[PDB]
Amino acid sequence: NTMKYIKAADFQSAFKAVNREILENPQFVTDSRIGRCNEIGSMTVVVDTPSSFKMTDPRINRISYEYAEDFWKFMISGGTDAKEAFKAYPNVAKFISKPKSDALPANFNTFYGPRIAAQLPALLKELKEKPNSRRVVFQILESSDQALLDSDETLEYPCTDSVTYYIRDGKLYTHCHMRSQNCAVVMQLDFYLQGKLLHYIANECGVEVGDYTHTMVSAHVFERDFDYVKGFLD
């Protein structure tokens, strides 16, 4: 029976449990926009100890932590010079290029950083000043991104939907809602970025960290990555 709720002590244990479940007990085996994948709809993953966002198993190597840290610095700095930030990574070129279509502006991008930066002042104020607020939600995916749907663009239509932060009894709790998660590869990056971001937020607020929840409307592993996943299970 497909297990959709996964609670783990640390990010790596969650990572491995999620990938094992998608490989072994998929809800769907489906031909997607970018190839065949095993998929579980609406997975919920809980990580008890979010400081563990850098996974230790060197076999989980498709996202190097050099790349993850460069991505983090690029994202938290809120800039748009992705060509410079990622010049050492030619394979990401199709995700950082200028919009081809005249429909949306040439300054249009779907980088998370500028959106986080735009919302940080209002969201930090709420998080710091309104006790026990439920209102602190970073919007990543935007309805204005829907202009990408019927286009030939290669820009990311944001896989991350929103990140909610809330503080109870001195601890920061985090809920990252993913529209779409490549659980074998990109989730290593997403776990790193979300781990860094929540510690950034917790430090800004002067609070300690509670736990981390990761919901994924589509949690998938592409068939082309099954061997890679098997390489780090066991």
Ligand X SMILES: Cc1cc2nc3c(=O)[nH]c(=O)nc-3n(C[C@H](O)[C@H](O)[C@H](O)COP(=O)(O)OP(=O)(O)OC[C@H]3O[C@@H](n4cnc5c(N)ncnc54)[C@H](O)[C@@H]3O)c2cc1C
Interacting residues with a copy of itself (CB under 8 A): 4-5, 28, 30-33, 39, 41-42, 44, 46, 115, 118-119, 122-123, 125-126, 130-135, 137, 139, 141-143, 146-147, 149-150, 157, 161-162, 164, 166, 168-169, 173, 175, 177, 179-180, 213, 215, 217-218, 220
Residue 60 contacts ligand X per CB under 6 A:
no
Candidate residues 17, 92, 124, 217; the one interacting with ligand X per rule CB under 6 A:
92
State the nearest-atom distance from the C-beta of 59 to a copy of itself, in Å.
27
- Using the contact rule CB under 6 A, the part of the chain among 43-51, 141-149, 160-168, 180-188 near ligand X is 180-188
State the nearest-atom distance from the C-beta of 64 to ligand DCM, in Å.
16
Residue 189 contacts ligand X per CB under 6 A:
yes
Give 231's strand partners.
none
Residue 221 contacts ligand X per CB under 6 A:
no
Residue 153 contacts ligand X per CB under 6 A:
no
State the nearest-atom distance from the C-beta of 37 to ligand DCM, in Å.
8
Distance, in Å, from the CA atom of 65 to the CA atom of 76, rounded to the nearest integer, reads 16
Residue 204 interacting entry, from ligand X, ligand DCM, a copy of itself, none, C-beta within 5 to 8 Å by type = none
1 vs 37, which CB is nearer to ligand DCM?
Answer: 37
Residue 82 contacts ligand X per CB under 6 A:
yes
85 vs 197, which CB is nearer to a copy of itself?
Answer: 197
167 vs 187, which CB is nearer to ligand DCM?
Answer: 187
Residue 111 interacting entry, from ligand X, a copy of itself, ligand DCM, none, C-beta within 5 to 8 Å by type = ligand X
26 vs 158, which CB is nearer to ligand X?
Answer: 158
Q: How far is CA 219 from CA 27, 35, 164, 214, in A?
A: 10, 14, 19, 10
Backbone angles phi, psi at 107, to 5 degrees: -85, -5
The answer to whether 24 and 203 have CB atoms below 8 angstroms apart is no
